[PDB]
Structure 1
Amino acid sequence: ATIHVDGKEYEVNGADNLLEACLSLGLDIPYFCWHPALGSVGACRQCAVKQYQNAEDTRGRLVMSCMTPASDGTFISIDDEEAKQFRESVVEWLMTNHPHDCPVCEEGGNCHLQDMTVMTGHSFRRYRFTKRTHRNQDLGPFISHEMNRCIACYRCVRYYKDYAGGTDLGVYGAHDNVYFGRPEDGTLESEFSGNLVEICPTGVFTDKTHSERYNRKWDMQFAPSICQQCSIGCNISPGERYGELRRIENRYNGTVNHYFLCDRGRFGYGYVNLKDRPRQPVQRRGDDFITLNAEQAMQGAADILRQSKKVIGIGSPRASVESNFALRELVGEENFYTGIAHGEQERLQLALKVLREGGIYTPALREIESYDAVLVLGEDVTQTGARVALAVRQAVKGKAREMAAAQKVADWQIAAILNIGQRAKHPLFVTNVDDTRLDDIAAWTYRAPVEDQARLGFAIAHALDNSAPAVDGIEPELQSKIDVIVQALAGAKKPLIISGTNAGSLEVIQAAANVAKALKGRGADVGITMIARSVNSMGLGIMGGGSLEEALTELETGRADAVVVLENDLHRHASATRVNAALAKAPLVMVVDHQRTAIMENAHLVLSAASFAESDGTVINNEGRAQRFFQVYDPAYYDSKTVMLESWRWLHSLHSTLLSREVDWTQLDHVIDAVVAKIPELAGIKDAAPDATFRIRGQKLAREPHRYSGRTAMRANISVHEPRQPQDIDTMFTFSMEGNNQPTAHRSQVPFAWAPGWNSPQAWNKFQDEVGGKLRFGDPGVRLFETSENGLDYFTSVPARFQPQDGKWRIAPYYHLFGSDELSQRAPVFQSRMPQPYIKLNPADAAKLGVNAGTRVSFSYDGNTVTLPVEIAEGLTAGQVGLPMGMSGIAPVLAGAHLEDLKEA
């Protein structure tokens, strides 16, 4: 299409509306109610331009550019005097009731309303009357509510309801008393409620966790990092100030997590700021804890390692690729053990084999929203991979999108799309041990044990393709529902099969692979998604090694006298008693970690590693994409006695001191090149980010904004002399403003979005080639593996039905978004949000034991009698007992595990 803006010709896409087309060209139109992800509704009337019928037209007409299609040969004007005066009048009308709140408002300096008030040039107030006020609600521990600052742009309700699928937020009231919130005080129920702080263009919804230790946006030090709280790998911008992590903002990745995080990623960063973290290396001498510097800790550790006869290394899926590789190099490939259980490692390896050998394309998180039918097998995605659940909701609304497109309704006119697609939606079939949070939009929900879910998947694969193995013992109504699933999936142009390793069953993953193969054989454009557990689970699976049980037997039999545990608490992957016995038997335990774990009581040496905020590295997400996270701040800048290094730096210097009796604090690119040379399956991680020599016209990339303040006074209480600026030899970023963050810079790693006149999160529009699309010059991250030409075979190992045996109790996993991730549990703000641990029981089983709802029962596993109060779960299958995974004492290795001595306390 061709448009003429202010007499200048432009070539745009005709399917877009005028506002997004003009913002993609760099033109500045003020706007409030439109969002690139939510569509156009034409409420705020801020985006007004003047449209003319032809070139020889002088009068024109004011139109909303967000609601005007960018048709071919469209003549408009933004800088028309009438349009400018109307946009100024809209800003003024918004400003009549706005509170005098900017100094004491957390959105100041990050406010879209401030930016558009300045952009319209409106700075004189001629309104002399009273301003309306509102009471505020309590929205829980995460979101702070300030209703006075609202401009009634309806972004919150549209996002939270039409996009996120939440139910408890809404718009109440009338003419100019419109209220946006919950009907009563209470916590926002959605797992994606945290994106309201970026969706809201004003200070109504604010980050309460940030509002505790508040600082303005110009005062933050930012870095482009990857969220470490599950395997999705959403791009984040951690921002720090005064040596502590202050905020997690969304970082735009048009291929992964474009505008939206989940609440675990956004608010579960509080473990970084804990005061019990290791900040110096500590050596045990009898009962004494001697604090060492880097050099003497490395010398003593390498000497004791040299006197040892066999050193084993226990990695972790929390650690980066470089740190796991450095441990593998230090202890040797044959002595390296992945720090996960044998069943967990088997499920992880099977998921990786399906992803990179099954011949079926695995979509990115953004690409999930374009699929026509979704089958989720055994994976509670809302609690384990939440952004996948959000993308599944978008893919479900794709049917309403297609129905509206059949009636020649444009894709940005969201109200008409929702009107045409009333309740018609794409087929969604979820299977779990109980009800999921996707049940409100699911076409069918199957509450069954993991064997029965696997048998359902194998039956679906057999009915789609008769070459697949059959299932014997299917009930006729279950067969009818299976047939419903089969005709829904076979009629889909782009079916999607989602599973993962959190189900605790190998057969569920095998059944999902069988369904995907059966759909691939029919010619469908099938995609497969596997949800892992931790941030670098796929990286640890690609690296390979032994299981944690093998390392425990190596420690117990005395074949290994030295163990180096990297970023692993060892209690989430094995029993605590056996781990404690093996670590007490081992004469040398060296724990390289950044969190105070329980295994440092018996550890001979504790190396104060860096977390993601204080380190660089690479992580492989659930779809096999290598992503580089960068260090946010130097921990030794404010506390000069802090020796907190990267884990790969610790292990590489330990290897160098073990070999040549000399420390070597290496560079990140050297470890990256070592990974690429030694492990060819991880050769793609070289291209995740450019090396430390990367420059933009000769200068580095800035971590902090141009107006970063207090540089001669933040450390003046320690010493009036300004310290040396921390040098960054590992990466292309600098710990200063002396760098580049231009939106037109040829790069893909963007620490934060800021353009002049756009201080809000809306500056990501300036950082994209087209708004709502990809990052300009490509999104960061590279897929490690391509789709194989030939797939796997059908898995003939069809499990039997779940048999409830007396005495035994099958543990059904119950994951929680706030409580299943270890570091997220360590965050103090999650302690109020996380629920009290309830053991879930069937009504029939609770009647059999005679226990009611709320009474405490005690059960023993691995000789550990623990007590929990009972919650009645009707959707659970009899013979199963539900356990909340990741919680206090309930390790996630209990999925699929049997249970003994379930008795009332």
Structure 2
Amino acid sequence: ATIHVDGKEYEVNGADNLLEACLSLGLDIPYFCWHPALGSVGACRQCAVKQYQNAEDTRGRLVMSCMTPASDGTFISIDDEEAKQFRESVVEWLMTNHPHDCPVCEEGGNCHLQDMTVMTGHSFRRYRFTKRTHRNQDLGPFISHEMNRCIACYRCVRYYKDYAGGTDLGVYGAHDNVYFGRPEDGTLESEFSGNLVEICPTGVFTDKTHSERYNRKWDMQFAPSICQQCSIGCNISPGERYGELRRIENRYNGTVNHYFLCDRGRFGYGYVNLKDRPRQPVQRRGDDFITLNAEQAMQGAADILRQSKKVIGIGSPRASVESNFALRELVGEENFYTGIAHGEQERLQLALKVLREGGIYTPALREIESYDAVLVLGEDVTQTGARVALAVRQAVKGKAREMAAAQKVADWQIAAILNIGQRAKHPLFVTNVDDTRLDDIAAWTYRAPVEDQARLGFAIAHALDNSAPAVDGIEPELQSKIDVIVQALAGAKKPLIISGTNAGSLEVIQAAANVAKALKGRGADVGITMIARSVNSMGLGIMGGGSLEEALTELETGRADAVVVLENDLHRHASATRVNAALAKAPLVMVVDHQRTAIMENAHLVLSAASFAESDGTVINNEGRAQRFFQVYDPAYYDSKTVMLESWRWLHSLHSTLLSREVDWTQLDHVIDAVVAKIPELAGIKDAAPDATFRIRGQKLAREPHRYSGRTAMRANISVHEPRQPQDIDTMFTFSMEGNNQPTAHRSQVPFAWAPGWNSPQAWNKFQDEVGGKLRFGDPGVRLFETSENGLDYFTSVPARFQPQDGKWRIAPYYHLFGSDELSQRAPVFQSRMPQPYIKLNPADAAKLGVNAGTRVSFSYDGNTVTLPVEIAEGLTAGQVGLPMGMSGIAPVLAGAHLEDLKEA
């Protein structure tokens, strides 16, 4: 398509509207109510341009550029005097009721309304009458509410309801008394409510966790990092000030998590600021503790490990690929063990084998939204991999998109698309032990035990292909629902099968693989998605190693006397009594970690590892994509006594001091080259980011904005003499303003979005090739494995039906977005969001045991009895008991396990 803007000719996409086409070209049109992910509605009237009928037209007509298609031969003017006057008038109308709040408003310096007020050139007030005011609501621990600052742009309700599927936010009232919020005071129930603070162009919805320790955007130090709180791999921008992690902003990745995080990633960062974190290496002598510097810790640990007969290693899916590899190098591959349990490891390697040997393409998170039928087997996606649930919601709305495209409706005119596709949607079939948050859009929800979910999957596979193994003993009603699922999946042009390791069953993953293979054999464009548990679960599975039980047997038989434990709370993957026994028996326990874990009282040496904010590394998401995270700040800048190093730096220095009796720390690229040389299956992590010698025209990439303030006063209470700038020999980023953050810079790693005149999150428009697309020179991260040419065979081990047993309660997992990821539970703001741990019972089982709702019942596991209060769960089938995985005292390894002597307390 050809458009003519202010006399200049441009080539654009004819399926785009004029606002997105002009913003993709670098032109500046002010806008409020349009968002790239939400489409156009034409509410705020800010984006007015003057459209002419042809080239020889002089009058024109004011139109909304967001509501006008960028068709071939369009003639518009942005800098027309009437259009500029109207845009300034719209800003002025928004400013009549706006409170005098910018100094005490958390959006200041990051405010889209401030930027557009300046952009329209409106700075003189002639309105002299009263300003309307509003009372505020309490919205829960994460989002602060200030309705005085609202410009009624409807972005919040459109995102929250139409995009995110939330139900407790809305618009109320009338003409100029329109109020955006909840019907009453209460916590926002959506798992994606935290994106409101970036969606809202004003300071109505603000990050309350940031507001407790507020600082302005120009004062932050940013880095491009990866969210550690689950396996999805959403790109984030952690921003710090005065040594503490202050905020987590969304970092745009056009392939992964484009505009949106989940609330666990956005608000579950507070463990980094915990005061009980290890700051320096501590060694226990008798019952006392002494603090060493890094050189003495290396010398002493190397001497003691050299004296030992066999050192074994216990990695973690928390830790990066470099640190796990450095542990495997320090102790040896045969003496290296993965820190996860045997069944967890078997499910993880089966998921990996399906992903990289199943012959079926695994889509990225953005690509999930294009599939026209979704079958979720076992995985409670909203509580474990929430952004996948958001993408599946978009894929479900794909049917309304298709029916609107049949009627020649433009893809950005979102209200018309929603009107045409009233309640029609692509088929979603979710299976779980109970009800899920996807049930409001699911075509069918199967509440059954994990073996019954696997039997449903195998029956679906056999009904799609007769070569797949059959399931005997299917009820006619279940058979009819299976036929409904099979007819939906067979007629789909792009079916997606989602599963994961959180369901705690191998047969669920095998059933998902068999359904994917049956759909592949019919010539369909089937995709398969696996959901892992932690941030680098797939990296630990690719690296491999023995299970935690093998390391426990090594430490219990006594043939291993030294154990290194990296970034691992061992009680999550094994019983606490066995771990405590094996660590009390071991004459040397060394723990490299960044959080005060429960195995640090039996640890002879504790090394203060860095968290993700203070470290660099590579993590593998469940898609198979290697992603590099970068250090945000130097922990020794404000407190010079802090000895907090990268985990791979600690372990490499330990290996060097063991071999050559000399302390060499390392560089990061040397560890990357070591990983890709010893491990060919991790050879893709070299290309995840450029090395530390990468430059943009000779200069490094800046971590802090240009107007970073207080550089001669922020440490002046300690000493008036300014310290040296911290040196980053690890990466291509500099710990200073003296660097490059241009939107046109040839790079893929962007620490923060800022452009002149665009101080809000809308500067990501400037950092993109087209708005809502990808980053200009490609999204960061590369895929480790491609689709295999040949798939697997059908798994013939169909499990039997679940039979309840008397005195034997099968544990059904109940994951929570706030509580099932260990580090996020450590965050103090998650305690207010923390649900009370309730054990779920069937009405029949609770009636048999004579316990009502809210009564305390005690159950015995691993020879220990614990008491939990009863919540009645109707959907949970009999013979099962529901437990919240990952909580304080309930390990995720308990999922799929049995339980004995459940008695009323």
Q: Give the shorter-chain TM-score range.
A: over 0.9
CA distance in 2, matches of 1:505, 1:857: 27
**The residue matched to 2:828 in structure 1 has which SS?**
coil
CA distance in 2, matches of 1:69, 1:830: 45
The Cα offsets for residues 53-80 of structure 1, whole Å up to 9 and x where unpaired, read as 0000000000000000000000000000
CA distance in 1, matches of 2:81, 2:246: 43
**The residue matched to 1:833 in structure 2 has which SS?**
coil
CA distance in 1, matches of 2:165, 2:90: 31
The aligned residue for residue 630 of structure 1 is 630
CA distance in 1, matches of 2:519, 2:61: 53
State the 1:288 CA deviation. Answer: 1.0
Normalised by the length of structure 1, the TM-score is 1.00
State the 1:668 CA deviation. Answer: 0.3
State the 1:888 CA deviation. Answer: 1.0
Structure 2 gaps, min length 5: none
CA RMSD of aligned residues (A): 0.2
State the 1:864 CA deviation. Answer: 1.2
The Cα offsets for residues 698-738 of structure 1, whole Å up to 9 and x where unpaired, read as 00000000000000000000000000100000000000000
State the 1:536 CA deviation. Answer: 0.0
CA distance in 2, matches of 1:559, 1:512: 41
The Cα offsets for residues 835-859 of structure 1, whole Å up to 9 and x where unpaired, read as 0000000000000100000000000
CA distance in 1, matches of 2:159, 2:799: 42
State the 1:823 CA deviation. Answer: 0.1
The Cα offsets for residues 593-615 of structure 1, whole Å up to 9 and x where unpaired, read as 00000000010000000000000
Runs of 4+ in structure 1 off by over 3 angstroms are none
State percent identity of aligned pairs: 100
CA distance in 2, matches of 1:57, 1:421: 39
**The residue matched to 1:345 in structure 2 has which SS?**
helix
The Cα offsets for residues 839-888 of structure 1, whole Å up to 9 and x where unpaired, read as 00000000010000000000010011000000000000000000000001
State the 1:403 CA deviation. Answer: 0.3
CA distance in 1, matches of 2:864, 2:840: 19
CA distance in 1, matches of 2:804, 2:859: 18
The Cα offsets for residues 202-256 of structure 1, whole Å up to 9 and x where unpaired, read as 0000000000000000000000000000000000000000000000000000000
State the 1:774 CA deviation. Answer: 0.3
Instruction: State the number of aligned residues.
Output: 905
The Cα offsets for residues 346-400 of structure 1, whole Å up to 9 and x where unpaired, read as 0000000000000000000000000000000000000000000000000000000
CA distance in 1, matches of 2:409, 2:638: 57
The Cα offsets for residues 637-665 of structure 1, whole Å up to 9 and x where unpaired, read as 00000000000000000000000000111
CA distance in 1, matches of 2:289, 2:655: 24
The Cα offsets for residues 394-430 of structure 1, whole Å up to 9 and x where unpaired, read as 0000000000000000000000000000000000000
CA distance in 2, matches of 1:886, 1:477: 35
What are the equivalent positions in structure 2 for 1:182-193 lying under 5 Å apart?
182-193=182-193
CA distance in 1, matches of 2:833, 2:858: 25
State the 1:196 CA deviation. Answer: 0.1
The aligned residue for residue 461 of structure 1 is 461
The Cα offsets for residues 792-820 of structure 1, whole Å up to 9 and x where unpaired, read as 00000000000001010100000000000
**The residue matched to 1:439 in structure 2 has which SS?**
helix
**The residue matched to 1:325 in structure 2 has which SS?**
helix
CA distance in 1, matches of 2:478, 2:602: 53
State the 1:3 CA deviation. Answer: 0.1
CA distance in 2, matches of 1:25, 1:264: 35
CA distance in 1, matches of 2:676, 2:554: 29
CA distance in 2, matches of 1:48, 1:494: 39
The Cα offsets for residues 316-337 of structure 1, whole Å up to 9 and x where unpaired, read as 0000000000000000000000
Structure 1 gaps, min length 5: none
CA distance in 1, matches of 2:373, 2:18: 32
CA distance in 2, matches of 1:450, 1:393: 24
CA distance in 2, matches of 1:450, 1:772: 39
**The residue matched to 1:264 in structure 2 has which SS?**
helix
The aligned residue for residue 393 of structure 2 is 393
CA distance in 2, matches of 1:797, 1:131: 70
**The residue matched to 2:351 in structure 1 has which SS?**
helix
CA distance in 2, matches of 1:852, 1:477: 31
The Cα offsets for residues 524-581 of structure 1, whole Å up to 9 and x where unpaired, read as 0000000000000000000000000000000000010000000001000000000000
CA distance in 1, matches of 2:665, 2:349: 33
**The residue matched to 1:404 in structure 2 has which SS?**
helix
The aligned residue for residue 232 of structure 1 is 232
State the 1:834 CA deviation. Answer: 1.1
What are the equivalent positions in structure 2 for 1:608-623 lying under 5 Å apart?
608-623=608-623
State the 1:478 CA deviation. Answer: 0.2
CA distance in 1, matches of 2:414, 2:791: 40
**The residue matched to 1:355 in structure 2 has which SS?**
helix
The Cα offsets for residues 141-161 of structure 1, whole Å up to 9 and x where unpaired, read as 000000000000000000000
The Cα offsets for residues 678-708 of structure 1, whole Å up to 9 and x where unpaired, read as 0000000000000000000000000000000
CA distance in 1, matches of 2:473, 2:165: 37
CA distance in 1, matches of 2:264, 2:559: 41
The aligned residue for residue 549 of structure 1 is 549
The Cα offsets for residues 274-331 of structure 1, whole Å up to 9 and x where unpaired, read as 0000001000110110000000000000000000000000000000000000000000
CA distance in 2, matches of 1:477, 1:875: 17
State the 1:33 CA deviation. Answer: 0.1
CA distance in 1, matches of 2:829, 2:774: 33
CA distance in 2, matches of 1:490, 1:662: 64
**The residue matched to 1:249 in structure 2 has which SS?**
strand
CA distance in 2, matches of 1:663, 1:901: 54
The Cα offsets for residues 37-60 of structure 1, whole Å up to 9 and x where unpaired, read as 000000000000000000000000
CA distance in 2, matches of 1:42, 1:372: 29
CA distance in 2, matches of 1:65, 1:465: 51
The Cα offsets for residues 723-778 of structure 1, whole Å up to 9 and x where unpaired, read as 01000000000000000000000000000000000000000000000000000100
**The residue matched to 2:148 in structure 1 has which SS?**
helix
The aligned residue for residue 797 of structure 2 is 797
CA distance in 2, matches of 1:536, 1:409: 43
The aligned residue for residue 566 of structure 2 is 566
The aligned residue for residue 867 of structure 2 is 867
CA distance in 1, matches of 2:242, 2:881: 47
CA distance in 2, matches of 1:489, 1:405: 22
CA distance in 2, matches of 1:707, 1:832: 36
State the 1:462 CA deviation. Answer: 0.2
